Design a binder for this molecule. Sequence first.
Ligand SMILES: OC[C@H]1NC[C@H](O)[C@@H](O)[C@H]1O
Ligand SMILES: OC[C@H]1NC[C@H](O)[C@@H](O)[C@H]1O
Ligand SMILES: [Mg+2]
Ligand SMILES: [Mg+2]
Lengths: 1015, 599
Amino acid sequence: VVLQRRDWENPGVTQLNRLAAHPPFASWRNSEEARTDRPSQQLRSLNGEWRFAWFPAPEAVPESWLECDLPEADTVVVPSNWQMHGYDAPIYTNVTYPITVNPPFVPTENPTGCYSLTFNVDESWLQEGQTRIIFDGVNSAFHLWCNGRWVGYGQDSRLPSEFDLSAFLRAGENRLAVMVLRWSDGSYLEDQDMWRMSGIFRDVSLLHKPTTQISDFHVATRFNDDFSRAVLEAEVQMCGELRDYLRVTVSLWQGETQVASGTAPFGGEIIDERGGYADRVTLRLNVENPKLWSAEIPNLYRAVVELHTADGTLIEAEACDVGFREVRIENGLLLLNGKPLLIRGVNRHEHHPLHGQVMDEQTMVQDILLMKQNNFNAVRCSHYPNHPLWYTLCDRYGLYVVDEANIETHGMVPMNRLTDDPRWLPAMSERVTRMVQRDRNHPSVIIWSLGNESGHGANHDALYRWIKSVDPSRPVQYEGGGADTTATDIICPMYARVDEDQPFPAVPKWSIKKWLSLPGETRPLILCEYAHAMGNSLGGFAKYWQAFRQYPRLQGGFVWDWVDQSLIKYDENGNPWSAYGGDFGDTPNDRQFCMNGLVFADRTPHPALTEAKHQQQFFQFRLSGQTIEVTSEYLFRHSDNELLHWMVALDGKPLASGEVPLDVAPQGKQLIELPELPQPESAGQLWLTVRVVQPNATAWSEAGHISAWQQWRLAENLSVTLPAASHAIPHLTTSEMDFCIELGNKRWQFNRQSGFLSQMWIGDKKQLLTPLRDQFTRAPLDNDIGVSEATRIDPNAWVERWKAAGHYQAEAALLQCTADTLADAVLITTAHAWQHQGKTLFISRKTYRIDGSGQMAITVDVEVASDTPHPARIGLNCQLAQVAERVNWLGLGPQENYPDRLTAACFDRWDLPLSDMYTPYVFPSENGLRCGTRELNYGPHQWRGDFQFNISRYSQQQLMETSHRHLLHAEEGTWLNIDGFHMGIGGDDSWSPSVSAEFQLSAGRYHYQLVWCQK
Amino acid sequence: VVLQRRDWENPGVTQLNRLAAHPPFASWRNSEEARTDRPSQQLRSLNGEWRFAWFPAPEAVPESWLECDLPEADTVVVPSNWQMHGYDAPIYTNVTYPITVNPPFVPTENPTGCYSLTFNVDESWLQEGQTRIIFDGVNSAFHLWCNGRWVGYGQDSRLPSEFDLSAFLRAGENRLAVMVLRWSDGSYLEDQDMWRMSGIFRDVSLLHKPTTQISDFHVATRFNDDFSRAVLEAEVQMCGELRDYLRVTVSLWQGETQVASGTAPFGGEIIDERGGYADRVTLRLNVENPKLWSAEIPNLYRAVVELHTADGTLIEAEACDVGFREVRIENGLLLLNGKPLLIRGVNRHEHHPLHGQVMDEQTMVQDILLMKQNNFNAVRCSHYPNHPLWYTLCDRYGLYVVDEANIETHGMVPMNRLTDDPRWLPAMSERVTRMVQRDRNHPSVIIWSLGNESGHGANHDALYRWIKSVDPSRPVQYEGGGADTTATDIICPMYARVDEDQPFPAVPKWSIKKWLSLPGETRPLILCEYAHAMGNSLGGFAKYWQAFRQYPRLQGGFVWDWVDQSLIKYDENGNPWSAYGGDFGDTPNDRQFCMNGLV
Ligand SMILES: OC[C@H]1NC[C@H](O)[C@@H](O)[C@H]1O
Ligand SMILES: OC[C@H]1NC[C@H](O)[C@@H](O)[C@H]1O
Ligand SMILES: [Mg+2]
Ligand SMILES: [Mg+2]
């Protein structure tokens, strides 16, 4: 009968015998237990060891399995995904569906997981009341049997399914059987860009309720004009037999103090011509001076709802956390508690590198702490409802949540083929209505979303209107169909740029400043995705934050995204390594496109995370003379856990220091006057640095946490002292093959055929393994490669333009190599031309001046053909012979920084182990650059100038040829790249050229100089 | 397997294997035939004599009935209601449901009608193409078998159900079996004040289409400021295999004269980031000085849609009647073709004293003539979609139509118990979406209605918005929940008085002059029911007509109602007499309250 109906290939059947959706219940039988949130005896977990067998299709499952255990089944932990235990491969695909597109049919080869559990039920559970089983998430569809008898069917992987088991359970031993299908007609609605996995991946519980029970309750808060008086409105519904003696009490607690209370019999007000709801009641509770909930100060109350008799015998209690806050759109602005929000948001997927899509408390808490420590206030549930514990932790720690329906049909052509079709309106409505019914009581949820990337169809407008009518208290947003349709209260583009338009047919992406002012437009604009964090990325991030602060109706956005979705594999020696699409034999697949996070899958930060922290800070600073103005960007809190540290330094050396407490009202200013600063004798630039420190621990941070910082140049004294005249003169030797210069124990050799410095000796120890040569290329970054789908190549991507022009293959030809003795120096002059099939790309003219002090001054002038694509860099590289433990530099740091991502970095003297100067991105690329550098020390060498550098054990050629970080091997010696100039990295998106014109090397002529000496 | 699933007690299953809804098709294989509206060889009627047996429940039907005819079955005419042949009693109840209210369950004693037909299919129908069966209305739910094999299931009594029979038919003799249930979970949505009857009560047809076919088409008309230039916009969709040589032509005819024409290959404009519809095409035809449709002068054109090859071989044609008119609400007034309407309307049920709820051409024509001879210009389909011929006759003779979804839950307490519940949103959406997809091309339909007497729930606001988005060309109205909710473009009270207020709790009936001017109110007001014509009645009628003429935003209303719903019984001498509720042993019942007509 079950394989006869094939309910998984039928969009009109989304469930059989499933109970209504409701807020989370524990059925306490004691009000004190409910108030203090203690564990309930009536709610029993079935997590643990279950039996499991895998089958290639549902027709291959033996009939005996319903009756009793299969001999060849294994013991496995629930919750889990079965791909993580090795039964079949996880599939990573972005847009293309992982099955043939033939809606609503799915392949006959439909992998099937059979789970089963034997468990004991207590005798008191069968005498009276209702027993239900709850599956918090099953992917993608399943049938359930209890003691051999069929119970029901469910679809939608991301919301709980509940079934009544009262008529199926017996005293003693019981057996559940659950058959889970990988594919169903629900799969057409679940095309998110993520690993496709399956199984029972969220918790399983039994819940015991009495026959007369609370079946639903809703909480709402209404305010006066100044938020000094609130009304809590609770609506309660019951199921079972109505009696005259039944009563409902709602009490409101703040800690241990009862703050409000109300009691009533059942019976709503008249609703229409036929009467009202006999089985419902509304309580109104007045609260004076309520403490308001926000992400800055997450004040919660506890509401307890009791069903009891008139004589006062308790039947059951339920409870939730309540926050008083009002969200609304007024005159084009999104307001919380009367103030305009600025969203510092990120998109987050539920992902764990060992457990796949199984989430636990420990990982959720780790994410929330790291988010708040980096100045995030908001999270977008991309793109499905989360584990129910997630919303509780966002209520307690304080994050705003955007809660999103599990609907994405990206792989359809056109994108709205299903969402414009009335036969799929039933399936889509279950995904939205059940999410709102589960989550409507959480204060942290402030916006509902209709899904992601499904075009714009009439089913979207209908569901938009359904939510506005059942829940008027939250705005609704939807990005599909060009980001400003009639199904959204907020304009919510993805990857729109700050200043540049992208005029695509039908769905243009205006620049964000222009979009606000299109004729007729009045809504606020919040980007649902911006700043694609794929690999070495977030260039141009500061330009979004400058716009968000200047324009009132630009209210921020959600970065894409929090955590890299990589998985762990083991090699032959059992060493773990990070894997991406294609590494499991999954095909077709979309390769590294699954790794887009600010943090690695193990929750270690990428260098871009510090850039986000700095642009999102809650204190802004200005300097005028000796005065710092501090401006608070808090909306609700006074700065009561904040002190300002300032320091004045001269080229790294500290000169003066101090601290000042911060006493600044929300949205206010404070002026801090600095002491008379010292006048130093010596040459150099003075630097002032301020940092805001939190002296006391919070729920989310340690004592000493740095929350904000800023650096300025003060007075500069230029150096007018001429170098001391030495008595030694460098000696020049000319052979046919070489110029050699000697001075003491030091020796330099220049090859007369190649025209480069080929060797240096200190004593009799060689210093180079490779000559010092010009470099114009970089191992390309993900933003340079410019691919979102592995099958589709963009000929406008930087890496395509550089390969076509021959930048990676260009050969140096020598034009000139000459040597001359001056009075106190030897001068070497060289010129080279880089050519590819007749065309000259670059010319480089160089002088080397070696004086009596030992210092070698290098001067470089480069010309770049105006019709070649602009180069990625202009500098020198070589392979040094020695490996040292430390790197010491005077310049921006201490983390990796690039010309379009250097606002977070500070000028100072930095000292790190060599291994910290390499960023281990899983897909290897150019990495580890430090800009604005004046001095670099490594072993005996010192370089001085005004340059960017990177230093490591991997060549640019090795990083370009290697697809995975675990396959890189350290080379002999150390590779040094020293650049006079370096292109930006981009990252407005990663599938089209995104470097802004002010970060391209387009000048045509370039000059820089270095001194190389031995300290 | 069929009595194991019990699909009739489950609001989440409204159909199995039913094809998509679409405007009426005849599949002509010749453009001239399509233009002149001649009978199609590809559309075959199965009306006539069928076999029929009655059973007290679905579990009492013998298994043999699927294979072959029962000996104790009778010969009966289809279409019919089985209560009119004496198999059980018709029930007249106004508000109270005729079953125990226990949604979604129905009684186990669920009278069951088993119909069957033996018929011949021509050999050319099985070689190529698709063959479908169409039931225009079955009350209330049914399973269908062909040659012993289960085909599908449908609910909603008032809209067509279609099933593909290509894989089930054989050459020579075929047998259909249809098992019809009186009660289903669909009955909770069908609580209209009328006789409760059952059976196959509208036509049954076979339709033959080619494998590559026109699957849907829509017609829309846009105008300049003075109605001197129009654009006819036709959207056409196909099913089957896309080829480069396929083309669509739309021509527009006024009598014998071709007036406009356009041709194109398949391929819509870009819609979004993934492209456009490869299997759709939009033609735009310009028309100068079009003759405008109205109820006073019902000027029609004929649109012919041909699917053909580039060399000009015709694959199939479809056609409809087109009227050029614009309906809109502007500054609080309902305008047709730029002028403010005054609705002289009546509510009409499909009722015949001998045949029950079976409608025929002759009775429809008799009603329309009497309506127009008595100065009516408008009719409200109370409270369900009509027989498809009704809309064609209102196009040709000139009446405005309000077309209403088959949803009424009057007997619930409170009235919005189902329509405020998201688990019934699937069932309700099928009733609205399939009606709009069937009727959107008729010029006579000028307003959509969401149903009748179902309170006001969130399912109403969602469906209101669904229609405004798929069909912006007609206003939407809904009376429930106090007549002026967010689910209506028109204030549409029932039985509000001219000068006197009726201040009921939650749902007051203001007098109509006062309602127009409540702070914030800007919509026009048209009474969806007024002046109850029960017996010796219509006193005070002149006072409504005086108000309608004096106030611009009072634009008329629909009288309740056209025809008395009485039935014929026979005495001992065989003399016919008119019967009302209770005269068939039906109990409980609401007595003479079923007779409310002007005729
Ligand atoms: O990584 C690209 C990014 N683009 C937009 C989508 O919403 C995300 O799921 C993701 O696919
Ligand atoms: O005859 C009373 C009348 N009242 C209003 C209803 O809509 C009609 O169906 C009818 O019941
Ligand atoms: Mg996508
Ligand atoms: Mg009624």
